[PDB]
């Protein structure tokens, strides 16, 4: 006789910083990213809102 029960889940990350690349495939392929040098060939200012 076990009482009715509902699942809870969590995760924990300690010693990590979340990383979001600045690539269109999200991979590392060289430190200067492929969108970093795409923004040299399209010299324009933009705002960033996060």
């Amino acid at each position: 006789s076990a009482v009715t029960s509902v699942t809870q889940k969590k995760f924990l990350c300690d010693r990590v910083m979340w990383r979001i690349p600045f690539s269109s495939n999200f991979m590392s392929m060289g430190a200067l990213t492929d969108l970093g040098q795409n923004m040299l060939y399209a010299n324009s200012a933009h705002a960033l809102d996060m």
């Binding site: 991979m27 590392s28 392929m29 060289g30 430190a31």
Partner: peptide, 22 residues
């Protein structure tokens, strides 16, 4: 040993392999 932000191919893929237009 190897780690991140260092996985560099330099070279592209396709337009070096000769193609010419119609």
């Amino acid at each position: 040993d190897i780690n991140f932000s260092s996985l560099a191919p330099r070279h592209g893929t396709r337009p070096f392999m000769g193609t010419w237009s119609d």
